[PDB]
């Protein structure tokens, strides 16, 4: 936001490395709990992954991408440097905390 330097979050890439090709293919359906602008910290749903090119570079491979703009916000912005939690849900419906911000 050029008015005030707030830098809300649009989504999160997970990098392709030479070792995580199989574990990233294994996970669909991330679950997110974020801090919205006007509401507080809350659960905002569980959508499937998206598989975009890494960083938007057309030369980089496609990888897990959590499109936070498609979760159950009320159109509110997701805050940076606040409490963020992303859970990876296995096909066994076992969920693990794969990203923590506070």
């Amino acid at each position: 936001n050029p008015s005030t330097g707030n830098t809300y979050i649009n989504g999160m890439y997970f990098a392709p490395t030479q070792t995580n090709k199989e574990a990233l293919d294994y996970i669909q359906k991330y679950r997110v709990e974020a801090t919205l602008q006007y509401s507080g910290f809350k659960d905002i749903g569980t959508k499937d992954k998206e598989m975009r090119n890494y960083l938007g570079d057309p030369n980089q491979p496609k990888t897990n991408y959590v499109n936070l703009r498609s979760y159950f916000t009320g159109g509110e912005n997701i805050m940076t440097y606040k409490k963020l939690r992303i859970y990876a849900i296995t096909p066994d419906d076992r969920e693990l905390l794969v990203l923590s911000v506070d």
Binding site: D25, Y26, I27, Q28, K29, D48, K49, E50, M51, K62
Partner: protein, 154 residues
Amino acid sequence: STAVQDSNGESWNTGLSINKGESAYINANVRYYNTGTAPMYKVTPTTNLVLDGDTLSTIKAQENQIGNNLSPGDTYPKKGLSPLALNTMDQFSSRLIPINYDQLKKLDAGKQIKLETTQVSGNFGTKNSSGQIVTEGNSWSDYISQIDSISASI
């Protein structure tokens, strides 16, 4: 006054169009097998392609996908060959199998397409007035219902 202006520019455009009705084509590599007591000639299976609960297509095999012989315990294509491609939907193998935009989004989320064979057509071999084997017109479907009604399956 007098002015002379000399300009030169250059541009670069990249585009991308997308059809939401047919956003991708799918190609299934399949393989037949026979676990019965008799061979089937001119094997023509019919298969469902299922994403979640939605059947995307049911396709009866065309000339490209028909197996001529399939003996008990054998497999078409034979063991040691590669699977055959089932990549057309219409009667003359001229149209591909399409999916939606939402189905394509489900496919790259990691969801799998399941193949289900719903029936198989095929012929058996008899002898005509000569010592010759004939299989044309000898459909197994005339006997499937009758065999399955008086029998027990083991």
